[PDB]
């Protein structure tokens with residue numbers, strides 16, 4: 697019996713408020729009778745037609761992605777109220793996780809998380825899917841060994857955005873590359889906010905001068921250089937995610953070798 701019956705899903709606490717509506721914690725009983733902990737995304741009753749269409753449109757994309765480092769959609773109940781049943785990652789947001797665990801985390805782990813997210817982005821890049829919300833608030837911790845890229849950006853996060861996105865509202869895989877490097881900066885900074893010392897209006901001017909985020913204290917120089925390549929003003933000069941996977945794999949190996957693991 698393929699698909700998901702509503703009776704197979706029991707809701708518990710509210711987890712929070714997403715763009716379309718409330719997200720609940722719950723339990724899904726699958727076809728083997730196993731109890732699976734789930735995050736259940738809902739759409740507000742009083743929302744516009746275009747918002748409902750978009751809720752379902754994004755869900756169908758997520759249903760077709762099956763990547764170890766992208767949040768997993770388990771199923772969709774289309775009949776109103778429409779529920780999108782996701783896998784629950786109870787550790788929650790990576791930014792908060794990093795803050796909490798900063799005194800036990802090794803640099804090799806921070807590079808691992810970067811690499812994992814990079815792998816997900818390399819897959820999206822292969823189908824010219826532009827994500828727009830690659831940031832530690834939108835990465836989920838499945839386990840200490842595994843992070844997952846969250847839902848696509850509602851697209852204002854000026855301090856994460858490429859120059860062309862700020863200047864022209866242009867979003868491409870290369871602007872995702874820019875944002876991914878900002879995410880890496882956040883990770884290596886244990887979840888500090890990029891340009892916390894500036895206001896939004898000031899950013900593009902600084903970026904136009906060639907000024908960039910400074911190297912985080914624990915960031916290996918080799919990795920900082922890679923970040924600065926991602927922040928090339930010209931989108932065409934930025935590495936592609938497929939290139940970054942190879943580069944980050946090498947950085948990861950080096951950090952593991954230095955840590956003797």
Ligand SMILES: CN(c1ncccc1CNc1nc(Nc2ccc3c(c2)CC(=O)N3)ncc1C(F)(F)F)S(C)(=O)=O
Pocket residue numbers: 711712713714715718719735767768782783784785786787788789833834835836846847
């Ligand atoms: C809480 N919300 C979220 N905030 C940030 C990212 C993701 C979500 C919701 N989505 C998910 N959330 C989780 N887990 C999760 C999250 C946030 C916390 C916790 C768990 C415990 C906690 O304290 N905060 N696991 C899987 C998913 C999913 F669907 F993407 F697969 S919200 C504002 O209601 O949208």
